[PDB]
From Swiss-Prot:
This is 26S proteasome regulatory subunit RPN5. It comes from Saccharomyces cerevisiae (strain ATCC 204508 / S288c). N-acetylated by NAT1. It comes from the Eukaryota. Present with 5710 molecules/cell in log phase SD medium. The modification N-acetylserine is found at S2. The chain holds residues 1 to 136 of 445 of the full protein.
Length: 136
């Protein structure tokens, strides 16, 4: 580490993600299809349990396992996850669209006709504050 701040592992609910990631450093390195059914099961629990201060760290890599092992259909579900409980302003969670635009955008050169089954279904729930404008 280049910074002079000490490596105090303060460990909030993200401690799960810190302790399961080394179990998956063995499994994603050998199969990863079964690693998806471990790391994103945390996201699925953390959103529901209101432990989501952990979710916030899983969800940025949901596009690295879920879109990767051909569960790109569930990247739409992950933009939906946080948006389930409340009809809140989508611009606050449109930040997660960036992951849909990160690797779900191009997963093994993902075909338009396949990706449409993500982008056009999540369009229905995200046109509610449109894609073009921001916090205007």
């Amino acid at each position: 580490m280049s910074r002079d701040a000490p490596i105090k592992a303060d460990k909030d609910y993200s401690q799960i993600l810190k302790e399961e990631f080394p179990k998956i450093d063995s499994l994603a390195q050998n199969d990863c299809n079964s690693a998806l059914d471990q790391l994103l099961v945390l996201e699925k629990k953390t959103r529901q349990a209101s432990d989501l201060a952990s979710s916030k760290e899983v969800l940025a890599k949901i596009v690295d396992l879920l879109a990767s092992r051909n569960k790109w259909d569930d990247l739409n579900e992950q933009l939906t996850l946080l948006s389930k409980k409340h009809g809140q302003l989508k611009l606050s969670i449109q930040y997660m669209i960036q992951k849909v635009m990160e690797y779900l955008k191009s997963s093994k050169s993902l075909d338009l006709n396949t990706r449409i089954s993500v982008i056009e279904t999540i369009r229905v729930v995200t046109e509610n504050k449109i894609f073009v404008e921001v916090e205007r």
